[PDB]
């Protein structure tokens, strides 16, 4: 009923998906980021081996 | 410039840099009263006109290193750490601090040596200001890392519980100091003083409800960021092999709380980073993991509250597949075992506990044919153990309880797939003391034997 | 129906241990009513016939 | 302080919105199922 209710409930989920969403896009650019390199690791470690 | 964002689009430093940005300090009156150089007050005094209304850049900055140094008022040098941090984390203003401060590892030096000392405020500012500029490509230093995780005053503010802000930043500093792979071998050294503060903070979090809106751990925006943080900071920690399995033994007992914080919150942050920290240091990349995989499984119970938790899902499907890719490696990794010889070690062990494969028919459907190798010596050593344990080391005890239900519980699938276990039975004498167990107390044992001789009464009666 | 939270793991939890054993009671319960009812039945036609 | 969710059509949000209000009901806000996350 009231007008200011609808903004800061508004503002608030908007926010609060604004940080979700950045906090899921820093969590899969970490992930990402250690599945890479474990991956370089791994074929790294067996072409040193093979290599040695 | 082009500096990190970190610790600048949180509400607990915009609310803690708030109260010292609200506060103005006299730099003229400390230089009066010999306490700071003229020129180093006048351009901190200049500076904050010209953070603002001024965005060879970084020269005004060099004073402010010698007169923070020099001078031991922790007003001023919390203020000039938070003009000098908030000039260095904009885009628009500040931009010849970062290239000064990076070019020169002596004024970077001489800011971290500000730091932590003093109020928890000014360094907080000024560990944050040299994990800003330490956390970047422009330099790099364990040392200071190492240095500063080993002093009191920065590990202190985040030891304690009481300010979710200070302990936020300091976390949120370490999450991304701990997001380099070099920082984390220097930081996991100190994991067991933010160790328990990261699983205390879970489990208040836990053990209060996420439904109304309070200033607790809640589903608001500081509850998510901290829980977020928290288990952002295992879970950056999480990634080393050598690292899960000391994590996961020490941290096996807070370790559990991460399935129940899942399911009890409602956000995908604290479920994504929950499932990818058990998913982490269940990988087969870790040394001795089906210690920690047997052991988590085994003694924690882990299985069920993850099958259970595999069935509701939500957003961040990702974190979905990483419990449903744990969940089949977690439940093969112990299934693949062989159950004869885990279940003659765990009676020539004189040690039953319930366990996940220790209930099924199919255990024991298997291990029915090959306990027999004389006379059936498996049934009649498990039921020698059993009457034994009832014989010497008296009952309505809570020891004889649970391997008398485990050992009378077990009793029923092989007296129910294997009708000739009534002769070895009743030769050995278990079923005397199967009777004897109904009558006492431990009414789910009390039940276990009397299904165990409703089993036998089956078979020796239709 | 209090007003907070609940989940549904924990009742499907919390009731599938409860409703096997009293699947696993009733089954033995009414399999040694049917034995002892049986044996009952039996031991007065033994007596009678002995 | 406790959390309430309603549906119904976009035709009588105005008289469920102030039936709903009038007992007790506060911050009342219109929105989707796709504008959230």
Not at chain 2, 16 to 31: C, E, Q
Not at chain 3, 4 to 30: C, F, H, K, P, W
Not at chain 3, 34 to 48: G, M, P
Request: proline fraction near 2%.
């Amino acid at each position: 009923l009231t007008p200011n209710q609808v903004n800061d409930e508004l503002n608030k989920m908007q926010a609060f998906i604004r940080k979700e969403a950045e906090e899921k896009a820093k969590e899969i650019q970490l992930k990402a980021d250690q599945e890479y390199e474990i991956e370089k690791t791994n074929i790294v470690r067996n072409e040193t081996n093979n290599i040695d | 410039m082009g500096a990190t964002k970190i610790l600048m689009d949180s509400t607990h430093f915009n609310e803690i840099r708030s109260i010292i940005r609200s506060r103005s300090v006299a730099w003229d009156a400390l230089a009066r009263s010999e306490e700071l150089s003229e020129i180093d007050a006048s351009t901190a005094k200049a500076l904050e006109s010209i953070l603002v209304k001024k965005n060879v850049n970084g020269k005004t900055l060099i004073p402010l290193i010698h007169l923070l140094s020099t001078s031991d008022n922790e007003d001023c040098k919390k203020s000039v750490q938070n003009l000098i941090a908030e000039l260095l984390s904009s885009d628009k203003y500040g931009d010849d601090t970062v290239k000064f401060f990076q070019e020169d590892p002596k004024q970077l030096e001489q800011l971290f040596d500000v730091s932590l000392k003093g109020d928890f405020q000014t360094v907080l500012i000024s560990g944050f200001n040299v994990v800003s500029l330490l956390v970047q490509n422009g330099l790099h230093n364990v040392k200071l890392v190492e240095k500063l995780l080993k002093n009191n005053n920065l590990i202190n503010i985040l030891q304690n519980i009481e300010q979710m802000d200070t302990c936020y930043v300091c976390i949120r500093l370490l999450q991304e100091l701990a997001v380099i792979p070099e920082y984390r071998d220097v930081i996991w050294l100190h994991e067991k003083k933010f160790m328990p503060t990261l699983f205390k903070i879970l489990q208040r979090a836990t053990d209060s409800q996420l439904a109304t809106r309070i200033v607790a751990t809640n589903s608001n925006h500081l509850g998510i960021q901290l829980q977020y943080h928290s288990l952002l900071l295992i879970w950056l920690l999480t990634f080393n092999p050598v690292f899960a399995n000391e994590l996961v033994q020490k941290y096996l007992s807070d370790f559990l709380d991460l399935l129940k914080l899942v399911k009890i919150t409602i956000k995908e942050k604290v479920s994504r980073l929950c499932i990818s920290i058990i998913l982490q240091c269940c990988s087969t990349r870790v040394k001795q993991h089906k210690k920690v995989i047997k052991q988590l499984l085994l003694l924690g119970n882990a299985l069920p509250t993850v099958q259970s938790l595999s069935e509701r899902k939500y957003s961040d499907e990702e974190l979905r597949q990483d419990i449903s890719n744990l969940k089949e490696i977690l439940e093969n990794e112990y299934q693949e075992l062989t159950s004869f010889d885990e279940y003659v070690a765990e009676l020539d062990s004189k040690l039953l506990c319930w366990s996940p494969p220790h209930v099924d028919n199919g255990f024991w459907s298997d291990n029915i044919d090959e306990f027999k190798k004389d006379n059936y010596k498996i049934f009649r050593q498990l039921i020698e153990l059993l009457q034994a344990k009832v014989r010497n080391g008296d009952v309505n005890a809570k020891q004889e309880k649970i391997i008398i239900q485990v050992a009378l519980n077990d009793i029923t699938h092989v007296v129910e797939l294997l009708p000739e276990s009534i002769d070895v039975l009743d030769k050995t004498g278990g079923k005397a003391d199967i009777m004897e167990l109904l009558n006492h107390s431990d009414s789910r044992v009390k039940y276990e034997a009397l299904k165990a001789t409703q089993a036998i009464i089956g078979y020796t009666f239709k | 129906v209090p007003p907070s939270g609940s989940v549904i793991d924990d009742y499907v939890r919390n009731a599938s241990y409860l409703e096997e054993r009293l699947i696993q009671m009733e089954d033995a319960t009414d399999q040694i009513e049917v034995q002892k009812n049986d044996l009952e039945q039996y031991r007065f036609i033994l007596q009678s016939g002995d | 302080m406790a959390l309430v969710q309603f549906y119904i059509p976009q035709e009588i949000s105005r008289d469920s919105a102030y039936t709903l209000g009038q007992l007790g009901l506060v911050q009342f806000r219109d929105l989707n199922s796709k504008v959230r996350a």
